[PDB]
Structures are given as C-alpha cells and as structure tokens.
Amino acid sequence: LGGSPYSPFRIGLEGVWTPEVLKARASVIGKPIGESYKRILAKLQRIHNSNILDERQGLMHELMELIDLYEESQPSSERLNAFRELRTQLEKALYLPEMEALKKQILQIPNKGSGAARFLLRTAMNEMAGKTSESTADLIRFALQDTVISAPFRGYAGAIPEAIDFPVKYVIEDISVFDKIQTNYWELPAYESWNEGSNSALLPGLLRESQSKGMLSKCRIIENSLYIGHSYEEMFYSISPYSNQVGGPYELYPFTFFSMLQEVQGDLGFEQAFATRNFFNTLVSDRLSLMENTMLLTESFDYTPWDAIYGDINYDEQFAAMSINERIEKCMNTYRGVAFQNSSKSIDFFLNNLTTFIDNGLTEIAISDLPYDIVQQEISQFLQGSNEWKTLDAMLFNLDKGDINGAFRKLLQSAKDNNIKFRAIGHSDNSVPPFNNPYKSLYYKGNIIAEAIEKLDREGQKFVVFADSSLLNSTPGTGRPMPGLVQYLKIPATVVDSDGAWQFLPDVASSRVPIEVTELENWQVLTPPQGKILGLKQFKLTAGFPTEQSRLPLLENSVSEDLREELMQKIDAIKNDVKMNSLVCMEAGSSDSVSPKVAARLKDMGLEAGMGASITWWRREGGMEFSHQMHTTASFKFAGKEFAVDASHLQFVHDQLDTTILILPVDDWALEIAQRNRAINPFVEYVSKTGNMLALFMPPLFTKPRLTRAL
Numbered sequence: 008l009g010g011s012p013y014s015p016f017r018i019g020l021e022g023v024w025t026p027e028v029l030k031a032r033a034s035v036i037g038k039p040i041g042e043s044y045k046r047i048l049a050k051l052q053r054i055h056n057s058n059i060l061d062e063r064q065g066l067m068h069e070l071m072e073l074i075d076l077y078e079e080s081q082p083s084s085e086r087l088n089a090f091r092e093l094r095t096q097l098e099k100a101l102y103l104p105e106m107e108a109l110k111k112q113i114l115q116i117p118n119k120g121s122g123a124a125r126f127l128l129r130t131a132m133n134e135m136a137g138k139t140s141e142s143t144a145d146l147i148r149f150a151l152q153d154t155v156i157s158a159p160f161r162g163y164a165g166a167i168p169e170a171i172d173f174p175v176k177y178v179i180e181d182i183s184v185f186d187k188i189q190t191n192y193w194e195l196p197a198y199e200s201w202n203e204g205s206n207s208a209l210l211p212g213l214l215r216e217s218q219s220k221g222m223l224s225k226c227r228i229i230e231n232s233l234y235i236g237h238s239y240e241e242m243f244y245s246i247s248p249y250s251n252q253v254g255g256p257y258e259l260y261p262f263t264f265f266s267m268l269q270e271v272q273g274d275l276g277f278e279q280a281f282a283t284r285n286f287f288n289t290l291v292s293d294r295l296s297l298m299e300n301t302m303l304l305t306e307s308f309d310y311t312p313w314d315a316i317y318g319d320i321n322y323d324e325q326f327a328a329m330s331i332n333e334r335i336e337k338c339m340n341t342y343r344g345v346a347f348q349n350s351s352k353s354i355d356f357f358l359n360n361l362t363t364f365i366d367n368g369l370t371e372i373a374i375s376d377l378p379y380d381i382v383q384q385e386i387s388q389f390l391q392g393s394n395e396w397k398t399l400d401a402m403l404f405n406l407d408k409g410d411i412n413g414a415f416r417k418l419l420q421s422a423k424d425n426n427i428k429f430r431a432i433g434h435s436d437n438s439v440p441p442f443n444n445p446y447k448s449l450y451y452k453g454n455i456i457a458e459a460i461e462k463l464d465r466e467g468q469k470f471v472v473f474a475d476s477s478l479l480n481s482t483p484g485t486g487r488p489m490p491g492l493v494q495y496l497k498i499p500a501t502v503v504d505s506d507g508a509w510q511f512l513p514d515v516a517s518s519r520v521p522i523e524v525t526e527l528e529n530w531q532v533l534t535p536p537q538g539k540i541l542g543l544k545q546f547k548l549t550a551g552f553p554t555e556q557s558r559l560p561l562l563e564n565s566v567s568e569d570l571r572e573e574l575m576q577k578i579d580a581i582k583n584d585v586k587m588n589s590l591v592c593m594e595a596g597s598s599d600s601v602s603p604k605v606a607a608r609l610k611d612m613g614l615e616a617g618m619g620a621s622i623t624w625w626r627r628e629g630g631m632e633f634s635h636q637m638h639t640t641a642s643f644k645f646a647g648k649e650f651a652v653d654a655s656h657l658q659f660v661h662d663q664l665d666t667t668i669l670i671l672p673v674d675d676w677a678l679e680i681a682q683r684n685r686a687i688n689p690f691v692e693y694v695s696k697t698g699n700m701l702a703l704f705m706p707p708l709f710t711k712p713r714l715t716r717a718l
C-alpha cells in the first residue's frame with residue numbers, strides 16, 4: 008500500500024479548506040484578489056491536487072510561510088481571520104496531537120517553505136515508523152545553529168535577466184545600497200586616478216579591471232542590479248590582503264569589491280542578505296541531506312581495528328623508535344598511507360624526504376586546505392602545465408600567508424615535477440569561520456571524510472594526506488564520537504615537532520565523545536518501543552494461500568547450502584514428532600497454551616530454544632472500533648537464526664491441505680500471519696508471550712487507525 012488510509016502519516020486533507028471555501032471566507036467587499044492572495048489560492052489548489060505525500064506536506068509548509076509573510080506585510084488586513092484559520096488547519100493536518108514538542112521545534116525555524124521543515128517532518132515520521140535511525144533531534148540542533156537555515160530570509164526573490172550566462176547565487180537588487188555604507192572607497196589612494204563620486208560609481212570599474220586579470224569573472228551589473236556566481240566561501244578564501252595587496256599579482260580591486268559587499272551585509276548573514284531564494288532553498292535542503300549522511304557515517308563505527316594497530320599507549324614510542332626511513336617504508340608498504348598535520352613544518356619534512364616516499368610507491372598527495380568543488384579542474388590545469396588556474400593561485404597565496412615560496416605551493420609544485428597525483432579533499436560549503444559551533448564543525452569535517460573515503464582508500468594506492476588536527480583524529484559528534492580521516496582510512500596521524508621530530512599524533516580520549524546537549528523543549532522520544540512495525544498499511548495475501556511449496560524457498564535461502572540438508576532433517580523431525588502433533592490446535596487464541604508446550608518439547612528433542620516471537624495488529628470491529636489481535640510462537644535456534652514452530656496457525660485462514668505445524672524463519676512467519684489475517688499496522692516483538700502479556704499485547708498506540716480532523 009503506497010499511501011494507506013490506516014497510516015497515521017497519510018497527511019489527509021479532510022480538515023483543510025479548498026480554494027473555493029477560502030474565497031467565500033476571505034472575501035471582502037470592494038477588495039479584489041491581490042497578488043499575494045492569488046498565489047495563496049494557487050498553492051492551496053496544488054496541495055489538494057497533490058498525490059505524492061512528501062510533496063503535499065512540502066507544499067503545505069510553503070503555504071504556512073506565505074500566510075506568515077502576508078500576516079507580517081498586511082497586519083491590519085481583514086482577510087487575516089480566514090488565513091489564520093487555514094494556517095492552523097495546515098499545522099493540525101501535518102502535526103498529530105502527540106507531536107506537540109516536534110511541531111514547536113520545527114515551526115520555530117524561520118522560512119517554513121525553505122525545505123527545512125519538510126525535511127525535518129519527513130525524518131521525524133520515518134523515525135517514528137522505525138524506518139530511519141534516531142536523528143531528528145540532532146538535525147533540529149544543526150538547523151537551529153546554522154547561519155543559513157536559522158536565518159529569516161532577506162535576500163532576492165525577483166527574476167534573473169536572460170543575458171547572464173552563469174548560474175546566479177547572490178543578487179544585490181539596488182546598487183545604491185553601496186553608497187549608504189560608512190567607508191568611502193572612492194576616496195582611497197588607489198582610486199584617485201578614477202575620479203569617482205561614490206562607491207556605486209567605482210563598482211562597474213572594479214569588476215571590469217578584475218575581470219581582465221582573471222578574477223571576478225562571474226559578476227555582472229544589469230540595470231542597477233549586481234548578479235554574482237562566485238560562492239561566499241570561494242571569494243573569502245581567494246580574496247584577502249595576502250592575495251590582493253597594493254601592486255600585487257591580483258591588485259586591490261577584488262578585495263575592495265568583497266570588502267564593501269561585507270559592509271552592505273551589516274550584521275546579517277551573507278546568504279540571508281544577498282542569496283537568491285532559489286539558491287537559498289537549495290542550500291538549506293542540501294546542507295540537511297549532507298549532515299544526515301555524515302551522522303549516518305558515524306553510526307556504529309568500530310574503533311577496534313584502528314585501536315588494535317595505533318591505539319596502544321606506547322605506539323608513539325614504537326613509531327619514534329624506528330628510523331625515519333623505516334617509518335616511511337612502514338607507512339607506504341604496510342599502512343599504505345600516512346597523514347600529517349597541515350603545518351609548513353610537516354610539509355617541509357615531507358618534501359625533504361620525498362624521494363624516499365616515491366621509491367616506496369607513493370601515488371598520491373591529498374590536502375583538505377583546498378576545496379575540490381572549486382579548484383579541482385584548476386589543479387589539473389596546473390599539473391598539465393596549462394595556465395587557467397587563477398583561483399587556485401590566489402588560494403595558495405592565502406594559505407601561504409602571501410609567501411612566494413610557501414609550503415602549500417611547494418607541495419603542489421613537487422607533485423607536478425615528480426608526476427605524483429594531487430587531490431583537494433576539502434569542500435567549500437560552510438567552510439568560512441568562526442567554527443564556534445560543534446555542528447558546523449561536524450558538517451564540514453563530514454564532507455571532507457566522505458570525499459576521502461571515496462577517493463583515497465583504494466587497493467592500488469599509497470597516499471599522503473595533509474589536514475587540520477580537528478580533521479585527522481576524533482571530534483565530538485551526534486550522540487557518539489565523530490572519527491577522523493585517519494580512523495576511517497586505517498592510517499596514523501602525525502606531526503612534525505618545532506625541532507624536526509616526526510611523531511605520532513594520538514587520538515586522545517577527551518575528543519572521542521558525543522557533543523554536549525540539552526534536551527530540546529519538552530522533547531519526546533520518536534523511535535518505536537522495541538521490536539518492529541512491519542508496515543503502516545493493511546497486509547494482504549499477494550499470491551493466494553501459502554503452501555509448503557511456496558515456503559520451501561524461504562527455508563532453503565535462510566541458511567547456507569552446506570547446512571541446508573540438516574535444517575530440512577530438523578524440520579522433518581519436528582513435523583513427524585508424535586508429541587508435537589499432540590499439541591496441534593486450531594482454536595482461536597490457542598497459541599497461549601500451545602506455544603510453551605512446543606518450547607518444552609523442542610528442548611526434549613535436543614534442539615536449542617529460541618526466544619520466540621509475537622505479532623499483534625489492529626482489526627476493524629463493528630461501529631468504527633478497532634480491536635487488537637495477537638499471536639505468539641515458540642522457536643528453535645539454528646545457524647544463528649530463529650525458526651518459528653507454530654502448532655496453532657490453522658486457527659487462521661489457510662490452504663485446504665496445509666501442514667498442521669508451521670515452520671519458517673521468524674520474519675517470514677510474521678509476514679505470513681499478518682497477510683493471512685489481513686492485519687492493519689502489525690507489530691512484532693521477538694519474544695514469545697503468555698497470559699496477560701499476550702492478552703494485552705498491542706501495537707504502538709499512535710498506529711491505531713484514527714479519523715482525520717475535522718472540520
């Protein structure tokens with residue numbers, strides 16, 4: 008069932024007004040339908056025409072924002088009674104009564120139609136359904152601190168001129184905002200020969216001159232509006248006094264352009280102030296996608312393999328005891344890789360010993376201090392001897408503090424001359440400081456690790472990585488530690504001392520922790536109790552009654568081929584046991600007394616007892632009531648798997664010739680029982696139950712089918 012009427016998450020529209028009902032409710036005498044209101048009406052229609060439930064709830068969140076905006080811009084509008092009513096209906100259609108705390112957290116985030124609320128509700132519902140792991144609270148925490156997601160949108164929503172040939176990220180709509188800032192950049196010594204009245208008058212010149220030198224190529228002014236295709240982070244790491252001093256390789260013009268952008272920005276966020284809404288919404292939803300993958304990556308990470316090699320208290324001494332050349336040989340031929348802290352000292356040491364590394368099969372050098380999403384093609388240009396690498400070059404001046412030599416530049420140079428592959432593993436997004444928040448840090452680290460896993464641990468590779476200490480070893484994560492590049496790649500992290508000692512960098516215990524959290528306001532746990540919701544639908548027989556014929560593949564595929572014949576022997580033994588056939592019952596509810604007798608007989612036959620299993624579900628009763636129905640079974644253990652032995656299954660609808668004792672892997676047993684009973688929202692616990700504990704065993708209460716509000 009792709010959208011069951013029995014699911015609590017069906018997002019039903021029964022209690023949400025249609026456009027025509029709204030018209031009559033929001034009609035005011037002498038006031039024709041304005042443009043805000045006509046887009047509110049079109050959004051409502053889309054909601055009612057929406058078949059895809061995820062999209063529907065997305066559109067509903069969008070409508071809530073439009074109503075928020077209308078309410079803010081028209082505080083005395085007489086249409087506000089109807090709109091406030093509609094907004095409440097949308098909240099109640101999306102957020103069930105038991106979701107109050109979730110609702111409060113999600114709807115406090117600004118810009119309800121930005122994609123954050125859509126993502127958070129999707130995640131919350133999957134978490135409650137037991138289809139995703141525990142993640143919602145932490146994603147809410149990430150969202151609340153993020154300078155893009157948690158910012159009320161103040162950017163550009165207008166159209167983009169068609170003459171622009173680059174994808175636009177930021178727009179300054181009215182150029183005259185530059186003339187409103189504190190600093191007179193037109194009065195600067197470097198612009199006396201320009202003789203310009205104001206900042207906005209400098210602007211066309213600043214672009215034109217930088218544009219020729221290679222920089223700022225994705226900036227265009229059309230009709231008093233400035234359009235930008237360079238990312239905030241790209242600009243920050245390629246434009247500074249280190250790369251843009253007076254009379255330098257890239258002059259002053261980019262730095263002045265960026266400096267006054269930041270002044271116009273004020274104490275708003277960059278994206279909050281200048282971003283296109285399209286680009287804003289894309290950023291919000293991609294940040295959340297990526298943080299989710301990062302968190303998933305930390306889940307159940309096993310430190311045992313790494314600690315087994317590098318985690319002994321004295322590994323530092325065993326590393327130090329070796330000669331420098333013995334370490335290089337070990338790192339290259341045994342570990343297949345090593346990582347250095349991103350200091351110039353470490354780079355210098357590496358370069359001083361480069362021949363030794365190459366002779367032992369070094370194939371690649373990787374650094375996190377450059378963003379592949381910006382400069383990877385330009386890096387390839389450098390290596391191919393070509394000249395189209397201006398942004399790369401400017402970023403190297405920044406990394407090298409404006410030095411002509413500089414460790415990072417030397418590193419790139421050696422890779423070219425020695426035919427070693429060079430890779431950037433940094434990602435530009437969310438990479439600009441301050442890193443005063445563990446979630447921003449974790450997000451940034453996670454993207455670098457994902458790239459490194461993808462590109463670096465490949466069987467025919469011997470690599471060296473240069474990265475920040477925070478990226479190399481473990482850091483605080485979401486409910487658990489966030490492991491470093493080095494743990495993920497199965498390598499050691501190293502530093503070079505101030506007096507040239509190449510030493511191991513231990514993963515300290517204080518870093519291998521969860522991020523410190525306060526519980527969110529009134530927060531309730533979302534994940535289901537214990538056991539499993541099979542599905543939020545009505546289960547049905549797909550292909551008629553099950554038979555021993557149909558069950559055979561389920562039994563044979565449950566175990567390896569060399570164990571197949573022993574399982575069948577055990578199943579034959581059970582089905583042809585005299586005391587087992589005595590226990591057979593087709594009375595309604597008989598599993599209560601039968602199941603324990605089965606467990607006792609299995610024991611006496613010399614089989615290993617399993618935990619058993621129980622299934623419970625809702626059943627439509629007379630007069631719109633739903634009762635709970637349940638069934639339990641004993642099991643045996645074989646090859647680390649549990650097999651139901653169900654001698655009371657014939658109380659349920661069955662094939663005419665069917666066996667009296669049902670034997671299937673527990674998961675196949677549950678499905679069969681659910682389908683034969685046409686079970687609504689069935690729930691399995693992997694224990695057999697008896698007496699009161701069977702008689703009142705029911706699914707999670709939020710799954711009991713209910714009517715939608717109302718109106």
Ligand SMILES: OC[C@H]1O[C@H](O[C@H]2O[C@H](CO)[C@@H](O)[C@H](O)[C@H]2O)[C@H](O)[C@@H](O)[C@@H]1O
Binds near residue numbers: 075
């Ligand atoms: O745009 C209006 C306001 O919307 C949000 O506040 C609403 O939603 C909260 C959570 O459900 C409620 O606590 C609150 O009573 C509602 O008004 C948002 O949190 C505010 O910042 C907006 O001003």
Ligand SMILES: OC[C@H]1O[C@H](O[C@H]2O[C@H](CO)[C@@H](O)[C@H](O)[C@H]2O)[C@H](O)[C@@H](O)[C@@H]1O
Binds near residue numbers: 076161163
């Ligand atoms: O630039 C200041 C204004 O920012 C917001 O308005 C922008 O964002 C809205 C939602 O995307 C658009 O509808 C609107 O056209 C944009 O200008 C904010 O809503 C306003 O209060 C500010 O004046």
